[PDB]
Design an enzyme around this catalytic site. Sequence first.
Site, mmCIF file in Angstrom:
data_model
loop_
_atom_site.group_PDB
_atom_site.id
_atom_site.type_symbol
_atom_site.label_atom_id
_atom_site.label_comp_id
_atom_site.label_asym_id
_atom_site.label_seq_id
_atom_site.Cartn_x
_atom_site.Cartn_y
_atom_site.Cartn_z
ATOM 1 N NE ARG A 143 -3.445 -0.259 2.778
ATOM 2 C CZ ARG A 143 -3.234 -0.613 4.040
ATOM 3 N NH1 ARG A 143 -2.955 0.307 4.948
ATOM 4 N NH2 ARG A 143 -3.306 -1.885 4.392
ATOM 5 C CE1 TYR A 163 -13.622 15.976 -16.200
ATOM 6 C CE2 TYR A 163 -12.924 15.065 -14.106
ATOM 7 C CZ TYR A 163 -13.432 14.890 -15.368
ATOM 8 O OH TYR A 163 -13.801 13.637 -15.767
ATOM 9 C CG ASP A 165 -6.813 19.077 -12.819
ATOM 10 O OD1 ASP A 165 -5.903 18.771 -13.621
ATOM 11 O OD2 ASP A 165 -7.860 18.415 -12.679
ATOM 12 C CE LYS A 185 -8.279 13.183 -18.657
ATOM 13 N NZ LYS A 185 -9.117 11.931 -18.522
HETATM 14 C C1 LIG Z 1 -8.647 18.390 -16.090
HETATM 15 C C2 LIG Z 1 -9.047 17.010 -15.654
HETATM 16 N N1 LIG Z 1 -8.810 16.636 -14.397
HETATM 17 C C3 LIG Z 1 -9.158 15.404 -13.963
HETATM 18 C C4 LIG Z 1 -9.756 14.471 -14.763
HETATM 19 C C5 LIG Z 1 -10.155 13.143 -14.182
HETATM 20 O O1 LIG Z 1 -9.168 12.126 -14.509
HETATM 21 P P1 LIG Z 1 -9.626 10.574 -14.434
HETATM 22 O O2 LIG Z 1 -10.589 10.338 -15.569
HETATM 23 O O3 LIG Z 1 -10.310 10.374 -13.088
HETATM 24 O O4 LIG Z 1 -8.301 9.855 -14.527
HETATM 25 C C6 LIG Z 1 -10.036 14.827 -16.093
HETATM 26 C C7 LIG Z 1 -10.702 13.872 -16.993
HETATM 27 N N2 LIG Z 1 -11.183 14.305 -18.114
HETATM 28 C C8 LIG Z 1 -12.120 13.742 -18.899
HETATM 29 O O5 LIG Z 1 -12.474 12.559 -18.785
HETATM 30 C C9 LIG Z 1 -12.738 14.668 -19.949
HETATM 31 O O6 LIG Z 1 -12.344 15.835 -19.930
HETATM 32 O O7 LIG Z 1 -13.542 14.172 -20.727
HETATM 33 C C10 LIG Z 1 -9.687 16.125 -16.535
HETATM 34 O O8 LIG Z 1 -9.929 16.540 -17.792
HETATM 35 C C1 LIG Z 2 -9.008 -7.437 7.834
HETATM 36 C C2 LIG Z 2 -8.269 -6.525 6.896
HETATM 37 N N1 LIG Z 2 -8.940 -5.553 6.280
HETATM 38 C C3 LIG Z 2 -8.310 -4.708 5.431
HETATM 39 C C4 LIG Z 2 -6.977 -4.793 5.145
HETATM 40 C C5 LIG Z 2 -6.351 -3.778 4.229
HETATM 41 O O1 LIG Z 2 -6.209 -4.322 2.887
HETATM 42 P P1 LIG Z 2 -5.131 -3.626 1.897
HETATM 43 O O2 LIG Z 2 -3.760 -3.955 2.429
HETATM 44 O O3 LIG Z 2 -5.388 -2.125 1.941
HETATM 45 O O4 LIG Z 2 -5.492 -4.240 0.566
HETATM 46 C C6 LIG Z 2 -6.229 -5.795 5.783
HETATM 47 C C7 LIG Z 2 -4.784 -5.917 5.533
HETATM 48 N N2 LIG Z 2 -4.076 -6.663 6.319
HETATM 49 C C8 LIG Z 2 -2.747 -6.643 6.523
HETATM 50 O O5 LIG Z 2 -1.956 -6.064 5.764
HETATM 51 C C9 LIG Z 2 -2.265 -7.381 7.775
HETATM 52 O O6 LIG Z 2 -3.149 -7.871 8.480
HETATM 53 O O7 LIG Z 2 -1.055 -7.444 7.955
HETATM 54 C C10 LIG Z 2 -6.889 -6.664 6.685
HETATM 55 O O8 LIG Z 2 -6.238 -7.643 7.338
#
Ligand SMILES: Cc1ncc(COP(=O)(O)O)c(CNC(=O)C(=O)O)c1O
Ligand SMILES: Cc1ncc(COP(=O)(O)O)c(CNC(=O)C(=O)O)c1O
Lengths: 395, 395, 391, 391
Positions: free
Chosen positions: B58, B111, B185, B210
């Site tokens: 993580r 946005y 942004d 992008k």
């Molecule tokens: C300036 C800006 N900032 C953030 C994001 C979100 O990025 P994510 O899509 O979540 O990776 C966008 C996405 N743009 C589009 O989809 C679109 O303009 O049609 C953006 O233009």
């Molecule tokens: C019951 C439970 N719930 C959520 C998470 C978080 O999951 P992510 O690591 O964010 O995918 C964990 C991760 N466990 C460990 O790393 C550990 O127990 O050492 C978990 O045991």
Amino acid sequence: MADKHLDTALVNAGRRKKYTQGSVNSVIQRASSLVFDTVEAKKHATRNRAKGELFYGRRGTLTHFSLQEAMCELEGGAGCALFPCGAAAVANTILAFVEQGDHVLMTNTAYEPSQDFCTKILAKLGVTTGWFDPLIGADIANLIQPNTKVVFLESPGSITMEVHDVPAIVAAVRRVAPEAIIMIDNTWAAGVLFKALDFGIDISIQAATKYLIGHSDGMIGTAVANARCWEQLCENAYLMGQMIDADTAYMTSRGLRTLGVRLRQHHESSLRVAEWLAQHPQVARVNHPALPGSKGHEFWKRDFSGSSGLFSFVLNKRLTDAELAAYLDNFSLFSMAYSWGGFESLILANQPEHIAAIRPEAEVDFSGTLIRLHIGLENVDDLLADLAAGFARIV
Amino acid sequence: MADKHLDTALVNAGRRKKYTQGSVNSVIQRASSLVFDTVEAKKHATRNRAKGELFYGRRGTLTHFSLQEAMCELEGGAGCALFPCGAAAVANTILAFVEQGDHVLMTNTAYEPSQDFCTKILAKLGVTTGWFDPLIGADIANLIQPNTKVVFLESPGSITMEVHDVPAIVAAVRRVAPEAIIMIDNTWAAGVLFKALDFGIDISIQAATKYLIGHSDGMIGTAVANARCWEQLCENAYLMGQMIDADTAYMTSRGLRTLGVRLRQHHESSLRVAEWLAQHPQVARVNHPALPGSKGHEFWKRDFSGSSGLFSFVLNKRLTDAELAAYLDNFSLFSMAYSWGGFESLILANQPEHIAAIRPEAEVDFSGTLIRLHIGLENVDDLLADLAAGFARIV
Amino acid sequence: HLDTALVNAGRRKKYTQGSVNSVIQRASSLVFDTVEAKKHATRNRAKGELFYGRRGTLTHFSLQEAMCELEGGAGCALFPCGAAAVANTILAFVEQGDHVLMTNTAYEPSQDFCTKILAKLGVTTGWFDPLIGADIANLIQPNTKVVFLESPGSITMEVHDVPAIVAAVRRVAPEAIIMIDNTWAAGVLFKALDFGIDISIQAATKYLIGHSDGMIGTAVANARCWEQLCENAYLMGQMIDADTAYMTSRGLRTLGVRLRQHHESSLRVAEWLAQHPQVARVNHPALPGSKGHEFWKRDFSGSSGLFSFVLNKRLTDAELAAYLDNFSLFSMAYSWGGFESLILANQPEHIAAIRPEAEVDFSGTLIRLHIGLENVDDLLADLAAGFARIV
Amino acid sequence: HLDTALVNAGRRKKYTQGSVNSVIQRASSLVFDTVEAKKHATRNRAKGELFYGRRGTLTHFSLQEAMCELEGGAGCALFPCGAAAVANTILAFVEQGDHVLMTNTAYEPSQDFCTKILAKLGVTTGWFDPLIGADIANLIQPNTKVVFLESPGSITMEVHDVPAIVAAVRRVAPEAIIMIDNTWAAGVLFKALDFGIDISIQAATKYLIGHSDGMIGTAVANARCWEQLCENAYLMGQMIDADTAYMTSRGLRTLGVRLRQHHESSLRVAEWLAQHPQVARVNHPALPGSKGHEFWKRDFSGSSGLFSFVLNKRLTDAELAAYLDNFSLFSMAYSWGGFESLILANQPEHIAAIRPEAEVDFSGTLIRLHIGLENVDDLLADLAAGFARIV
Ligand SMILES: Cc1ncc(COP(=O)(O)O)c(CNC(=O)C(=O)O)c1O
Ligand SMILES: Cc1ncc(COP(=O)(O)O)c(CNC(=O)C(=O)O)c1O
Ligand SMILES: Cc1ncc(COP(=O)(O)O)c(CNC(=O)C(=O)O)c1O
Ligand SMILES: Cc1ncc(COP(=O)(O)O)c(CNC(=O)C(=O)O)c1O
């Protein structure tokens, strides 16, 4: 699970021709932009952008839709939201249901990052958190406040493995606060050894990172909600930009296919290890849900269809820093790491005072070092020999 | 950018032997569990778990660390946080710096998902949001309240492309509220055509989806912070579980390597198209930062080192629903989709009243349909022919 | 226009399913819903119907269509790397008693396949100078089956007169199989099939992948030769994985913008080297005076970034280390075609050893450069610092 | 113990770098910091030092180490698929004038490589019945170079008496190269090299990948044969991509738990079929009475999930469609080794056509099943519904 009831469902979940296109597994559709051939197609996709029509990669591609269908089938839900990891699923699922002035009631055995999200993020946004002992059962009724919005369960508990009496908790919540959102972190059961939504819990959250991925090499969270709570979860998580990449979604679907065979081995091996530890002169206590006498074992036996491979035990002494190294540094098969759910057996130590610090408003009831084991797929006699060599280093 | 000043840095950013291990590109290290060989190694990793020592997936693996180093070098920051997509980066970066009672001041050209995060998530957590015209410049001082915690910029603006006078805004904010967190942004500039942190902005956020990915097939957000703001961003985003998968991190690093050659072509081609549109009888206005006369062009010319390929223009009429289909359904080269930044040219329409609805406390100053183009890597004469055929369908 | 074709090649809805790029379909088993569907798939097993993963999935079919469009072929066979494409494309067309003519500037693994694999299987190989042109007719034997070209040549960069070679082959043995390793041109700067070559082979590892992180070979054949190539390569189990196929399609999309930069930068470097007092010769197809430059200018539509030059002296081992160990931007590695600039050295006798039946015409140390995407003035400064370490 | 070895095989810190699994190192070019480093890498180019991506990266080296441990070999060569491993492993050891002996139950593409590729290159192939045992000695010619085994056989599942075959070969031609296609055993249920076989080949596509979504071949050789295999396969450009190598290593980790389920379920299905009135014969190595069952029980440490059975009649085309088109759980597809149960049919003359110089001994329609990970009672119900459609 040992009767293999779910094996066919695990092999087939989410696999429909529109996703698989002739292969056994779903295609991997990597996309941000999703193309609309016509204005009419764009209108239809927009209307159905949260309902499995291709619209934009943040909402998902075919690969995500296939995993979502699989998770809804296996956990009996109306929808499944996807997240970058388990901790993102916990934090964002809680956040999706709270507002300033609300209260969260969380088990004191919750995973530490879940607790820290509540105390370090929610508190400054005007959302308070209170705590309960995992064996509180029906007496949780007395802790529910007029502003309690979320009741957060985790069974077995993190590290110490206490199993809740979910039926008693749920019935008490519904008697006092029927509209509350009851959530569970159902990672230990892989969502399938404990059918949370059949018990009247509203949302079952997993770190799919653990047994669903099953190989220690992919991170992803899931949250499967009932019909009452799905739209709020879906749309509020989307406003936080929560998603997983298509490739990890594919790998999670792929992990489902072997989940039954894996879990049966983790159960068999881990219970054998627990039974041996429980007779060992250097062991004070074994915390394994499937082991008779463990805390909440009777509820595990009644409410679960099997066990996974994660459990803990308390040594007959607290290891000093030097003894901790002599013990942990010299294992041949167990690896020391965080996380669990894979093919590799893992070992992780916590001192009693470390656990006390993550049991809010509570004390621990043991004095030795707590060793958490994840029992993987190795031969159990080899694992026992590794544990025996460890005991000889600290005797 | 046309002088190719950054090309060497783009090729080399983040590539150190500890990440590349003999290859040109970083290794892909897929992991949740990260193994500690000894207790001493676990202690060191724990202490340094946010400082580029392997601790837990993580927090990142080698692949993430390499991308983070690249982004810090290219944007001149102290740290880079990674997210599942651009919208997750925006929402979680803002959330990391607010608490109940705070106020956010955001450009009205932000946005739409960024705006909706503020109005639909922050408001119910006790955080209010106010708005400003993108050309407000030094007059933003009058809108800053005693509780204004975050000032959120986006230059050029979404869809309508207005360029802020960042120096005037920043100087005014620092005169009235020197401790405010100024965020931008900076997706349109790919973080490299506008060196936001050199202008006194605290955090530069991108949808790496992008131009950094550059191929329409990967989603990822980044936020590069100065030293003053890094620890709060890092730790509060981590409490929300925000991360990206290792493979997408690898693909983002890989996209950096061609970013200079791509951006130069997007600039050349898009400005040629804009110049042609600006003389066309069926066009009312062209919104391209690099086109003289466009809103804030003088600031683009002073403050940016080049242009990307996204811009918009207003038709000489509002297309009816039927005309919109006749226009958009029959392009041969432009594809209709959301997002941008790839090799494929894209077209997306917004009616004037649609834009007005996403310009809080403001009105639009045009009456024709607004066409947003992303100019990709195709031959520009072929793109012009496609646009000309479109005009003939609506003349 | 090439740029538009590169962006669009292979992208049809049945492969992209709503995305810009093709889906990645990972499969061995491909499912038949009915006996009739299985029969149809079997009939169409080499014609873009899902049959079995060794033949390909949607992802492969999309790449194959793209390559056929861009190189003007009837079919495209896929391989695990360029060396596999060369070895298996030649093998597909030979049998005991056949003869192969190959340029003496062929890539060394191509030569070693001929001498170490083919010879013991009863297939002989003869050699020709890359500038032989029309005089290749005098080398064609009654059993010559394959004529194997590589233009420009490996390392030393000599450009063939393909029209003269092809016309001479067709005058003696019109049925011969003429093949080229067209990697340097990325299959698109030299339209081999339009010149009457039968099969254009590439190490897609180079500019098609474009990032030094994926290996794959391609072979695009005309209609006369496609079925034999396809089926005989399949009998050797040759395929590429779906993910690399996807990355190759993805690389095509930026190939035009990349190649133009490689051309601009490498020609500038070559022109500068040619003026340099520590340089004896520059071998760059685009540089005036280079071997076969007039055919490059006539027959190609651009240059890539790989070339070589000969130093004004033979470096000692100490000088070789002082030179090569201390570059700041150029990396020492095999391969080429990526964003990273690369450098390698060869002594003259090393090249002579891989010029069968021939000697070399230089005595200084040969340096091969791949000019990547870095700023050219930075690359020139790195080269200048190298010259100062050996002056 | 096999389960512990499967979890740990190939995992050393220089490949895993802190993770449980090996890193994925995608590369063609591999960089040399100095001339000396390049010389060292060159010397060690087949010995696990980074040299060039065609030889492998860290990810390949980790898989190769794992396969050598699990199969008890000196080296492991990697290929784009199982058919490439078979074809190229045989090709690596032959030349004009050599003879190959091959079981007549070999996988059909293996046979077609011999008849369609080898023969025209001057390498002859003769055939033997899989139960020939010690009598194979009478088929060894002065020019026999390779003896190619496949146990159990493709489709019909006959198990060789490997000890008797090997002893007879070694008595006549101790230097011969004995190879086996050991895919059904996943290389681990039958320890081929311990029986004196020289090279164990697998379609890692099957149980090593284990999910029907990745294609790869392996060949693990003893010390006597490794260098020739390695270098001659490399001359044909044979390699696998790094990502598939990673997925193959990853598949190993669950191979024990998967195989035990495939064994349990497939033996139960075979035992049930053997009692069924619509079944003439069951061909399952673990079923008593099956051809070579006594050698399976003696020489193997378990079973996988692939087997076949013969119906009590020859299905008409209408019956074939009624049977095969209406299964609910079994899918019709080629390949096997995954979590999905699969079904295919062959008429007796289809099998006779791929039994060179032999006839078949059955007249009913043959059904091949791959028993996956579904609940066995559900699979039995699907088979029972099929029987009811043709009774
Ligand atoms: C300036 C800006 N900032 C953030 C994001 C979100 O990025 P994510 O899509 O979540 O990776 C966008 C996405 N743009 C589009 O989809 C679109 O303009 O049609 C953006 O233009
Ligand atoms: C019951 C439970 N719930 C959520 C998470 C978080 O999951 P992510 O690591 O964010 O995918 C964990 C991760 N466990 C460990 O790393 C550990 O127990 O050492 C978990 O045991
Ligand atoms: C003209 C040509 N043809 C084929 C190949 C083989 O391609 P693969 O490496 O097997 O994908 C190469 C590789 N070149 C190198 O490594 C190098 O020149 O240092 C080549 O230059
Ligand atoms: C024993 C054996 N050896 C090699 C291969 C070829 O492996 P590849 O497909 O090239 O990876 C196979 C494949 N089997 C199938 O497809 C099938 O039996 O339907 C095999 O059974």
